[PDB]
Protein backbone atom coordinates (compact mmCIF):
# COMPACT_ATOMS: atom_id res chain seq x y z
CA UNK A 1 0.00 0.00 0.00
CA UNK A 2 2.72 2.50 1.03
CA UNK A 3 6.32 2.76 -0.28
CA UNK A 4 9.67 4.27 0.84
CA UNK A 5 8.69 7.60 -0.80
CA UNK A 6 5.56 7.76 1.43
CA UNK A 7 7.56 6.99 4.59
CA UNK A 8 10.01 9.68 3.34
CA UNK A 9 7.38 12.47 3.59
CA UNK A 10 5.63 10.68 6.52
CA UNK A 11 8.54 9.99 8.95
CA UNK A 12 11.68 11.39 7.19
CA UNK A 13 12.36 15.16 7.33
CA UNK A 14 15.27 17.47 6.37
CA UNK A 15 14.43 20.08 9.07
CA UNK A 16 13.53 20.13 12.80
CA UNK A 17 10.63 22.56 12.19
CA UNK A 18 8.18 21.21 9.55
CA UNK A 19 5.18 22.81 7.79
CA UNK A 20 2.20 20.66 8.92
CA UNK A 21 -0.61 23.25 8.48
CA UNK A 22 0.28 23.39 4.72
CA UNK A 23 0.84 19.64 4.07
CA UNK A 24 -2.09 18.35 6.19
CA UNK A 25 -4.76 19.65 3.70
CA UNK A 26 -2.87 18.07 0.72
CA UNK A 27 -3.73 14.70 -0.92
CA UNK A 28 -0.75 13.00 0.83
CA UNK A 29 -1.99 13.86 4.35
CA UNK A 30 -5.70 14.33 3.45
CA UNK A 31 -6.07 15.81 6.99
CA UNK A 32 -4.64 12.89 9.05
CA UNK A 33 -5.00 12.48 12.86
CA UNK A 34 -1.26 12.76 13.72
CA UNK A 35 2.25 12.29 12.22
CA UNK A 36 5.82 11.67 13.53
CA UNK A 37 8.90 12.97 11.63
CA UNK A 38 12.60 12.19 12.29
CA UNK A 39 15.63 14.51 11.82
CA UNK A 40 18.18 12.42 9.87
CA UNK A 41 19.24 11.36 6.33
CA UNK A 42 17.63 8.42 4.46
CA UNK A 43 21.13 6.99 3.70
CA UNK A 44 22.06 6.05 7.32
CA UNK A 45 18.38 5.55 8.31
CA UNK A 46 17.57 3.26 5.35
CA UNK A 47 21.08 1.74 5.81
CA UNK A 48 19.66 0.04 8.95
CA UNK A 49 17.20 -1.83 6.68
CA UNK A 50 20.07 -2.66 4.25
CA UNK A 51 19.60 -6.46 4.36
CA UNK A 52 15.85 -6.83 5.07
CA UNK A 53 13.94 -8.46 2.16
CA UNK A 54 10.55 -9.45 3.67
CA UNK A 55 8.19 -7.54 6.02
CA UNK A 56 9.62 -7.38 9.58
CA UNK A 57 9.33 -5.00 12.58
CA UNK A 58 12.63 -3.28 13.54
CA UNK A 59 13.38 -0.57 16.14
CA UNK A 60 16.01 2.15 15.39
CA UNK A 61 19.14 1.61 17.56
CA UNK A 62 20.15 5.31 17.45
CA UNK A 63 17.87 7.97 19.05
CA UNK A 64 17.10 10.95 16.76
CA UNK A 65 15.09 14.17 17.09
CA UNK A 66 11.40 13.67 16.21
CA UNK A 67 9.08 16.43 14.92
CA UNK A 68 5.52 15.06 15.27
CA UNK A 69 2.25 16.82 14.40
CA UNK A 70 -0.95 16.14 16.41
CA UNK A 71 -4.29 17.49 15.10
CA UNK A 72 -5.82 19.49 18.00
CA UNK A 73 -9.42 18.45 18.91
CA UNK A 74 -12.42 20.78 18.35
CA UNK A 75 -10.38 22.43 15.54
CA UNK A 76 -10.76 22.27 11.71
CA UNK A 77 -7.56 20.40 10.65
CA UNK A 78 -4.98 22.26 12.83
CA UNK A 79 -1.57 20.62 13.53
CA UNK A 80 0.71 21.22 16.55
CA UNK A 81 4.51 20.67 16.34
CA UNK A 82 6.15 18.57 19.11
CA UNK A 83 9.92 17.83 19.34
CA UNK A 84 11.39 14.80 21.19
CA UNK A 85 14.29 12.26 21.17
CA UNK A 86 13.61 8.49 20.85
CA UNK A 87 13.76 5.38 18.60
CA UNK A 88 11.02 4.12 16.21
CA UNK A 89 9.53 0.69 15.37
CA UNK A 90 8.87 0.26 11.61
CA UNK A 91 7.86 -2.57 9.22
CA UNK A 92 10.72 -3.09 6.72
CA UNK A 93 10.70 -5.10 3.47
CA UNK A 94 12.79 -4.80 0.26
CA UNK A 95 15.25 -2.79 2.45
CA UNK A 96 12.60 -0.04 2.97
CA UNK A 97 10.45 0.61 6.11
CA UNK A 98 7.11 1.70 4.60
CA UNK A 99 4.88 1.44 7.72
CA UNK A 100 5.15 2.79 11.29
CA UNK A 101 4.71 0.06 13.95
CA UNK A 102 5.10 2.41 16.95
CA UNK A 103 7.65 4.43 18.98
CA UNK A 104 10.12 3.21 21.67
CA UNK A 105 8.31 -0.15 22.11
CA UNK A 106 6.52 -2.41 19.57
CA UNK A 107 3.26 -4.17 20.66
mmCIF file of N, CA and C in Angstrom, residues 5-105:
data_model
loop_
_atom_site.group_PDB
_atom_site.id
_atom_site.type_symbol
_atom_site.label_atom_id
_atom_site.label_comp_id
_atom_site.label_asym_id
_atom_site.label_seq_id
_atom_site.Cartn_x
_atom_site.Cartn_y
_atom_site.Cartn_z
ATOM 1 N N UNK A 5 8.938 6.158 -0.508
ATOM 2 C CA UNK A 5 8.688 7.605 -0.805
ATOM 3 C C UNK A 5 7.612 8.147 0.142
ATOM 4 N N UNK A 6 6.648 7.318 0.497
ATOM 5 C CA UNK A 6 5.562 7.759 1.425
ATOM 6 C C UNK A 6 6.159 7.924 2.815
ATOM 7 N N UNK A 7 6.895 6.930 3.257
ATOM 8 C CA UNK A 7 7.559 6.991 4.593
ATOM 9 C C UNK A 7 8.540 8.171 4.598
ATOM 10 N N UNK A 8 9.050 8.536 3.434
ATOM 11 C CA UNK A 8 10.005 9.680 3.337
ATOM 12 C C UNK A 8 9.297 10.959 3.780
ATOM 13 N N UNK A 9 8.144 11.233 3.213
ATOM 14 C CA UNK A 9 7.380 12.467 3.587
ATOM 15 C C UNK A 9 6.622 12.246 4.902
ATOM 16 N N UNK A 10 6.387 11.001 5.264
ATOM 17 C CA UNK A 10 5.630 10.684 6.515
ATOM 18 C C UNK A 10 6.529 10.719 7.757
ATOM 19 N N UNK A 11 7.654 10.026 7.736
ATOM 20 C CA UNK A 11 8.538 9.985 8.950
ATOM 21 C C UNK A 11 9.929 10.583 8.690
ATOM 22 N N UNK A 12 10.318 10.802 7.449
ATOM 23 C CA UNK A 12 11.678 11.389 7.189
ATOM 24 C C UNK A 12 11.541 12.889 6.930
ATOM 25 N N UNK A 13 12.415 13.677 7.517
ATOM 26 C CA UNK A 13 12.356 15.163 7.331
ATOM 27 C C UNK A 13 13.774 15.728 7.231
ATOM 28 N N UNK A 14 13.925 16.826 6.524
ATOM 29 C CA UNK A 14 15.266 17.469 6.365
ATOM 30 C C UNK A 14 15.308 18.766 7.187
ATOM 31 N N UNK A 15 14.471 18.859 8.204
ATOM 32 C CA UNK A 15 14.431 20.081 9.065
ATOM 33 C C UNK A 15 13.737 19.747 10.389
ATOM 34 N N UNK A 16 14.155 20.384 11.467
ATOM 35 C CA UNK A 16 13.530 20.134 12.803
ATOM 36 C C UNK A 16 12.113 20.703 12.786
ATOM 37 N N UNK A 17 11.973 21.907 12.276
ATOM 38 C CA UNK A 17 10.631 22.560 12.185
ATOM 39 C C UNK A 17 10.018 22.210 10.829
ATOM 40 N N UNK A 18 8.846 21.610 10.831
ATOM 41 C CA UNK A 18 8.184 21.213 9.553
ATOM 42 C C UNK A 18 6.903 22.019 9.349
ATOM 43 N N UNK A 19 6.437 22.071 8.121
ATOM 44 C CA UNK A 19 5.179 22.809 7.794
ATOM 45 C C UNK A 19 4.033 21.793 7.744
ATOM 46 N N UNK A 20 3.323 21.652 8.841
ATOM 47 C CA UNK A 20 2.204 20.663 8.922
ATOM 48 C C UNK A 20 0.875 21.299 8.502
ATOM 49 N N UNK A 21 0.669 22.556 8.837
ATOM 50 C CA UNK A 21 -0.614 23.247 8.478
ATOM 51 C C UNK A 21 -0.741 23.417 6.955
ATOM 52 N N UNK A 22 0.337 23.229 6.215
ATOM 53 C CA UNK A 22 0.283 23.391 4.723
ATOM 54 C C UNK A 22 0.253 22.020 4.034
ATOM 55 N N UNK A 23 0.806 21.009 4.671
ATOM 56 C CA UNK A 23 0.842 19.636 4.067
ATOM 57 C C UNK A 23 -0.383 18.828 4.496
ATOM 58 N N UNK A 24 -0.900 19.098 5.672
ATOM 59 C CA UNK A 24 -2.090 18.348 6.192
ATOM 60 C C UNK A 24 -3.279 18.380 5.196
ATOM 61 N N UNK A 25 -3.615 19.541 4.631
ATOM 62 C CA UNK A 25 -4.761 19.648 3.696
ATOM 63 C C UNK A 25 -4.424 19.137 2.285
ATOM 64 N N UNK A 26 -3.242 18.582 2.077
ATOM 65 C CA UNK A 26 -2.870 18.068 0.717
ATOM 66 C C UNK A 26 -3.478 16.676 0.517
ATOM 67 N N UNK A 27 -3.195 16.068 -0.612
ATOM 68 C CA UNK A 27 -3.730 14.701 -0.917
ATOM 69 C C UNK A 27 -2.853 13.625 -0.259
ATOM 70 N N UNK A 28 -1.662 13.987 0.179
ATOM 71 C CA UNK A 28 -0.748 13.001 0.832
ATOM 72 C C UNK A 28 -1.168 12.825 2.288
ATOM 73 N N UNK A 29 -1.549 13.909 2.921
ATOM 74 C CA UNK A 29 -1.987 13.863 4.346
ATOM 75 C C UNK A 29 -3.509 13.728 4.398
ATOM 76 N N UNK A 30 -4.201 14.394 3.490
ATOM 77 C CA UNK A 30 -5.702 14.328 3.450
ATOM 78 C C UNK A 30 -6.277 14.612 4.852
ATOM 79 N N UNK A 31 -5.608 15.460 5.605
ATOM 80 C CA UNK A 31 -6.065 15.805 6.988
ATOM 81 C C UNK A 31 -6.017 14.542 7.866
ATOM 82 N N UNK A 32 -4.818 14.114 8.207
ATOM 83 C CA UNK A 32 -4.638 12.889 9.054
ATOM 84 C C UNK A 32 -4.852 13.242 10.529
ATOM 85 N N UNK A 33 -4.801 12.246 11.391
ATOM 86 C CA UNK A 33 -4.998 12.476 12.857
ATOM 87 C C UNK A 33 -3.689 12.964 13.487
ATOM 88 N N UNK A 34 -2.578 12.341 13.145
ATOM 89 C CA UNK A 34 -1.255 12.758 13.717
ATOM 90 C C UNK A 34 -0.111 12.190 12.870
ATOM 91 N N UNK A 35 1.068 12.769 12.993
ATOM 92 C CA UNK A 35 2.254 12.285 12.216
ATOM 93 C C UNK A 35 3.504 12.381 13.104
ATOM 94 N N UNK A 36 4.542 11.655 12.745
ATOM 95 C CA UNK A 36 5.816 11.672 13.532
ATOM 96 C C UNK A 36 6.999 11.728 12.563
ATOM 97 N N UNK A 37 7.724 12.830 12.553
ATOM 98 C CA UNK A 37 8.898 12.970 11.633
ATOM 99 C C UNK A 37 10.193 12.677 12.395
ATOM 100 N N UNK A 38 11.268 12.481 11.668
ATOM 101 C CA UNK A 38 12.597 12.195 12.290
ATOM 102 C C UNK A 38 13.644 13.098 11.620
ATOM 103 N N UNK A 39 14.577 13.613 12.390
ATOM 104 C CA UNK A 39 15.631 14.511 11.822
ATOM 105 C C UNK A 39 16.887 13.688 11.514
ATOM 106 N N UNK A 40 17.002 13.234 10.284
ATOM 107 C CA UNK A 40 18.184 12.419 9.867
ATOM 108 C C UNK A 40 18.130 12.180 8.358
ATOM 109 N N UNK A 41 19.192 11.637 7.803
ATOM 110 C CA UNK A 41 19.241 11.364 6.334
ATOM 111 C C UNK A 41 18.694 9.952 6.059
ATOM 112 N N UNK A 42 18.183 9.729 4.853
ATOM 113 C CA UNK A 42 17.629 8.416 4.460
ATOM 114 C C UNK A 42 18.754 7.414 4.155
ATOM 115 N N UNK A 43 19.975 7.894 3.992
ATOM 116 C CA UNK A 43 21.130 6.988 3.698
ATOM 117 C C UNK A 43 21.447 6.128 4.935
ATOM 118 N N UNK A 44 21.737 6.771 6.066
ATOM 119 C CA UNK A 44 22.063 6.054 7.317
ATOM 120 C C UNK A 44 20.800 5.457 7.947
ATOM 121 N N UNK A 45 19.659 6.085 7.737
ATOM 122 C CA UNK A 45 18.381 5.552 8.309
ATOM 123 C C UNK A 45 17.993 4.301 7.522
ATOM 124 N N UNK A 46 17.919 4.424 6.215
ATOM 125 C CA UNK A 46 17.571 3.255 5.351
ATOM 126 C C UNK A 46 18.704 2.226 5.419
ATOM 127 N N UNK A 47 19.913 2.675 5.715
ATOM 128 C CA UNK A 47 21.082 1.742 5.812
ATOM 129 C C UNK A 47 20.791 0.671 6.865
ATOM 130 N N UNK A 48 20.016 1.021 7.874
ATOM 131 C CA UNK A 48 19.660 0.045 8.950
ATOM 132 C C UNK A 48 18.870 -1.107 8.326
ATOM 133 N N UNK A 49 18.019 -0.788 7.377
ATOM 134 C CA UNK A 49 17.197 -1.830 6.685
ATOM 135 C C UNK A 49 18.030 -2.534 5.608
ATOM 136 N N UNK A 50 19.210 -2.019 5.293
ATOM 137 C CA UNK A 50 20.073 -2.656 4.248
ATOM 138 C C UNK A 50 20.311 -4.129 4.604
ATOM 139 N N UNK A 51 19.483 -5.000 4.070
ATOM 140 C CA UNK A 51 19.604 -6.461 4.355
ATOM 141 C C UNK A 51 18.205 -7.073 4.445
ATOM 142 N N UNK A 52 17.246 -6.315 4.945
ATOM 143 C CA UNK A 52 15.845 -6.831 5.074
ATOM 144 C C UNK A 52 15.243 -7.039 3.680
ATOM 145 N N UNK A 53 14.569 -8.152 3.483
ATOM 146 C CA UNK A 53 13.942 -8.455 2.156
ATOM 147 C C UNK A 53 12.429 -8.625 2.323
ATOM 148 N N UNK A 54 12.013 -9.231 3.413
ATOM 149 C CA UNK A 54 10.552 -9.446 3.672
ATOM 150 C C UNK A 54 10.070 -8.473 4.751
ATOM 151 N N UNK A 55 8.779 -8.460 4.999
ATOM 152 C CA UNK A 55 8.193 -7.541 6.024
ATOM 153 C C UNK A 55 8.619 -7.983 7.425
ATOM 154 N N UNK A 56 9.174 -7.066 8.187
ATOM 155 C CA UNK A 56 9.624 -7.381 9.580
ATOM 156 C C UNK A 56 9.589 -6.098 10.409
ATOM 157 N N UNK A 57 9.390 -6.214 11.704
ATOM 158 C CA UNK A 57 9.333 -5.000 12.580
ATOM 159 C C UNK A 57 10.703 -4.766 13.217
ATOM 160 N N UNK A 58 11.282 -3.611 12.972
ATOM 161 C CA UNK A 58 12.626 -3.280 13.541
ATOM 162 C C UNK A 58 12.546 -1.959 14.305
ATOM 163 N N UNK A 59 13.358 -1.820 15.331
ATOM 164 C CA UNK A 59 13.377 -0.565 16.141
ATOM 165 C C UNK A 59 14.734 0.119 15.956
ATOM 166 N N UNK A 60 14.729 1.392 15.604
ATOM 167 C CA UNK A 60 16.010 2.147 15.393
ATOM 168 C C UNK A 60 16.906 2.012 16.628
ATOM 169 N N UNK A 61 18.182 1.763 16.418
ATOM 170 C CA UNK A 61 19.139 1.610 17.561
ATOM 171 C C UNK A 61 19.620 2.988 18.018
ATOM 172 N N UNK A 62 19.684 3.933 17.105
ATOM 173 C CA UNK A 62 20.146 5.314 17.451
ATOM 174 C C UNK A 62 18.935 6.214 17.701
ATOM 175 N N UNK A 63 19.002 7.037 18.727
ATOM 176 C CA UNK A 63 17.873 7.967 19.048
ATOM 177 C C UNK A 63 18.050 9.253 18.245
ATOM 178 N N UNK A 64 17.010 9.690 17.568
ATOM 179 C CA UNK A 64 17.102 10.950 16.756
ATOM 180 C C UNK A 64 16.031 11.928 17.218
ATOM 181 N N UNK A 65 16.107 13.147 16.735
ATOM 182 C CA UNK A 65 15.087 14.174 17.088
ATOM 183 C C UNK A 65 13.823 13.824 16.312
ATOM 184 N N UNK A 66 12.670 14.029 16.902
ATOM 185 C CA UNK A 66 11.395 13.674 16.212
ATOM 186 C C UNK A 66 10.434 14.856 16.220
ATOM 187 N N UNK A 67 10.045 15.295 15.044
ATOM 188 C CA UNK A 67 9.081 16.426 14.921
ATOM 189 C C UNK A 67 7.721 15.835 14.556
ATOM 190 N N UNK A 68 6.866 15.657 15.537
ATOM 191 C CA UNK A 68 5.517 15.063 15.274
ATOM 192 C C UNK A 68 4.486 16.172 15.135
ATOM 193 N N UNK A 69 3.340 15.824 14.611
ATOM 194 C CA UNK A 69 2.251 16.816 14.405
ATOM 195 C C UNK A 69 0.922 16.196 14.831
ATOM 196 N N UNK A 70 0.352 16.687 15.910
ATOM 197 C CA UNK A 70 -0.949 16.137 16.410
ATOM 198 C C UNK A 70 -2.079 17.111 16.077
ATOM 199 N N UNK A 71 -3.135 16.614 15.463
ATOM 200 C CA UNK A 71 -4.295 17.488 15.100
ATOM 201 C C UNK A 71 -5.079 17.816 16.375
ATOM 202 N N UNK A 72 -5.088 19.073 16.763
ATOM 203 C CA UNK A 72 -5.825 19.493 17.997
ATOM 204 C C UNK A 72 -7.319 19.154 17.840
ATOM 205 N N UNK A 73 -7.982 18.794 18.937
ATOM 206 C CA UNK A 73 -9.418 18.446 18.910
ATOM 207 C C UNK A 73 -10.275 19.715 18.894
ATOM 208 N N UNK A 74 -11.497 19.606 18.412
ATOM 209 C CA UNK A 74 -12.418 20.784 18.352
ATOM 210 C C UNK A 74 -11.809 21.866 17.450
ATOM 211 N N UNK A 75 -11.016 21.455 16.483
ATOM 212 C CA UNK A 75 -10.379 22.427 15.540
ATOM 213 C C UNK A 75 -10.439 21.852 14.112
ATOM 214 N N UNK A 76 -10.663 22.708 13.113
ATOM 215 C CA UNK A 76 -10.762 22.268 11.707
ATOM 216 C C UNK A 76 -9.375 22.015 11.094
ATOM 217 N N UNK A 77 -8.895 20.796 11.219
ATOM 218 C CA UNK A 77 -7.564 20.404 10.646
ATOM 219 C C UNK A 77 -6.463 21.406 11.056
ATOM 220 N N UNK A 78 -6.069 21.361 12.310
ATOM 221 C CA UNK A 78 -4.984 22.258 12.828
ATOM 222 C C UNK A 78 -3.903 21.374 13.454
ATOM 223 N N UNK A 79 -2.674 21.480 12.986
ATOM 224 C CA UNK A 79 -1.574 20.618 13.531
ATOM 225 C C UNK A 79 -0.747 21.370 14.576
ATOM 226 N N UNK A 80 -0.158 20.623 15.488
ATOM 227 C CA UNK A 80 0.708 21.216 16.552
ATOM 228 C C UNK A 80 2.064 20.511 16.507
ATOM 229 N N UNK A 81 3.136 21.270 16.418
ATOM 230 C CA UNK A 81 4.507 20.669 16.338
ATOM 231 C C UNK A 81 4.997 20.247 17.728
ATOM 232 N N UNK A 82 5.610 19.081 17.808
ATOM 233 C CA UNK A 82 6.147 18.568 19.108
ATOM 234 C C UNK A 82 7.510 17.915 18.859
ATOM 235 N N UNK A 83 8.538 18.392 19.529
ATOM 236 C CA UNK A 83 9.916 17.834 19.341
ATOM 237 C C UNK A 83 10.251 16.851 20.467
ATOM 238 N N UNK A 84 11.001 15.812 20.152
ATOM 239 C CA UNK A 84 11.391 14.799 21.187
ATOM 240 C C UNK A 84 12.591 13.979 20.693
ATOM 241 N N UNK A 85 13.120 13.126 21.546
ATOM 242 C CA UNK A 85 14.289 12.263 21.170
ATOM 243 C C UNK A 85 13.953 10.815 21.536
ATOM 244 N N UNK A 86 13.955 9.921 20.562
ATOM 245 C CA UNK A 86 13.610 8.489 20.850
ATOM 246 C C UNK A 86 13.855 7.618 19.613
ATOM 247 N N UNK A 87 13.590 6.335 19.741
ATOM 248 C CA UNK A 87 13.760 5.378 18.603
ATOM 249 C C UNK A 87 12.385 5.131 17.967
ATOM 250 N N UNK A 88 12.332 4.378 16.886
ATOM 251 C CA UNK A 88 11.018 4.120 16.213
ATOM 252 C C UNK A 88 10.929 2.678 15.714
ATOM 253 N N UNK A 89 9.761 2.085 15.850
ATOM 254 C CA UNK A 89 9.532 0.687 15.375
ATOM 255 C C UNK A 89 8.855 0.771 14.007
ATOM 256 N N UNK A 90 9.450 0.183 12.990
ATOM 257 C CA UNK A 90 8.866 0.264 11.610
ATOM 258 C C UNK A 90 8.855 -1.108 10.930
ATOM 259 N N UNK A 91 7.956 -1.283 9.978
ATOM 260 C CA UNK A 91 7.859 -2.571 9.221
ATOM 261 C C UNK A 91 8.720 -2.435 7.966
ATOM 262 N N UNK A 92 9.791 -3.199 7.886
ATOM 263 C CA UNK A 92 10.717 -3.089 6.720
ATOM 264 C C UNK A 92 10.643 -4.303 5.800
ATOM 265 N N UNK A 93 10.718 -4.030 4.519
ATOM 266 C CA UNK A 93 10.700 -5.097 3.471
ATOM 267 C C UNK A 93 11.363 -4.511 2.229
ATOM 268 N N UNK A 94 12.080 -5.315 1.475
ATOM 269 C CA UNK A 94 12.788 -4.799 0.259
ATOM 270 C C UNK A 94 13.788 -3.710 0.692
ATOM 271 N N UNK A 95 14.272 -3.798 1.920
ATOM 272 C CA UNK A 95 15.254 -2.795 2.450
ATOM 273 C C UNK A 95 14.593 -1.404 2.524
ATOM 274 N N UNK A 96 13.319 -1.358 2.869
ATOM 275 C CA UNK A 96 12.598 -0.042 2.967
ATOM 276 C C UNK A 96 11.427 -0.131 3.975
ATOM 277 N N UNK A 97 11.532 0.577 5.107
ATOM 278 C CA UNK A 97 10.453 0.610 6.115
ATOM 279 C C UNK A 97 9.342 1.524 5.607
ATOM 280 N N UNK A 98 8.254 0.924 5.182
ATOM 281 C CA UNK A 98 7.113 1.702 4.598
ATOM 282 C C UNK A 98 6.025 1.997 5.634
ATOM 283 N N UNK A 99 5.952 1.218 6.693
ATOM 284 C CA UNK A 99 4.881 1.445 7.717
ATOM 285 C C UNK A 99 5.480 1.764 9.085
ATOM 286 N N UNK A 100 4.697 2.414 9.920
ATOM 287 C CA UNK A 100 5.152 2.789 11.292
ATOM 288 C C UNK A 100 4.487 1.862 12.312
ATOM 289 N N UNK A 101 5.265 1.009 12.940
ATOM 290 C CA UNK A 101 4.713 0.057 13.953
ATOM 291 C C UNK A 101 4.385 0.816 15.235
ATOM 292 N N UNK A 102 5.314 1.625 15.698
ATOM 293 C CA UNK A 102 5.099 2.412 16.952
ATOM 294 C C UNK A 102 6.374 3.180 17.308
ATOM 295 N N UNK A 103 6.455 3.660 18.531
ATOM 296 C CA UNK A 103 7.652 4.433 18.984
ATOM 297 C C UNK A 103 8.190 3.840 20.294
ATOM 298 N N UNK A 104 9.498 3.760 20.422
ATOM 299 C CA UNK A 104 10.123 3.212 21.668
ATOM 300 C C UNK A 104 9.876 1.702 21.760
ATOM 301 N N UNK A 105 8.639 1.305 21.988
ATOM 302 C CA UNK A 105 8.308 -0.150 22.106
ATOM 303 C C UNK A 105 7.419 -0.580 20.937
#
